């Protein structure tokens, strides 16, 4: 519930 999936560096 705590974090979003993303590629490193995404702004």
């Amino acid at each position, epitope marked *: *519930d*705590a974090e*979003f*999936r*993303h590629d490193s560096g*995404y*702004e």
Partner: antibody
Amino acid sequence: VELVESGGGLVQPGGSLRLSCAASGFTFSSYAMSWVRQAPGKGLEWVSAINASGTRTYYADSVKGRFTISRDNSKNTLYLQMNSLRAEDTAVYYCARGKGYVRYFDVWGQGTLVTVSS
Amino acid sequence: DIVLTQSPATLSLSPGERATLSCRASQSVSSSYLAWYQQKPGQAPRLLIYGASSRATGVPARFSGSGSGTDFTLTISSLEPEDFATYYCLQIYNMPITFGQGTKVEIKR
């Protein structure tokens, strides 16, 4: 389990506005959150997101560098500071709770209307 | 960016008919991260289906979701009057979070 937004209204282009979303009925600090908007008559557009701790924020290209998402976990409140507002930022803004990484949005606010016009 | 293309843009259907709504992704999306929402005028979106196939609590069995990879489907087996609304798919598999542009299901009379 509820999310209640406020802070919407009319602002001139180039202006600033802060939206709030008050969370109740759940442990606010446990959940990643997001803002989503919907221009009148148009589709849903993701705006910004933040992890449960507030340590990492995320922005859509349309709003990067103009909007700042923040939270105050001790106040069960999510914020969206909108700066350098443009006519195309006009929309109903919703806060949404992430649910699981976050897999979907399960709870939504009622929405608050922001109009950007001279 | 993962573009979600919903088709058709609009459906005109009679009560009791099957509604088949498509959401095509521009690249593969883990099915755990693909959800469907219903929205009626003046209201916030309501979660219908999460993880491609799981019904949210309170959602009737006539709603079902399926699919994987780049092709996802929401099926309403037999349309009730309260099912006429706009339907959006959503992916939270990768940033930026994206929605499909919606399919509006209208009542044929």
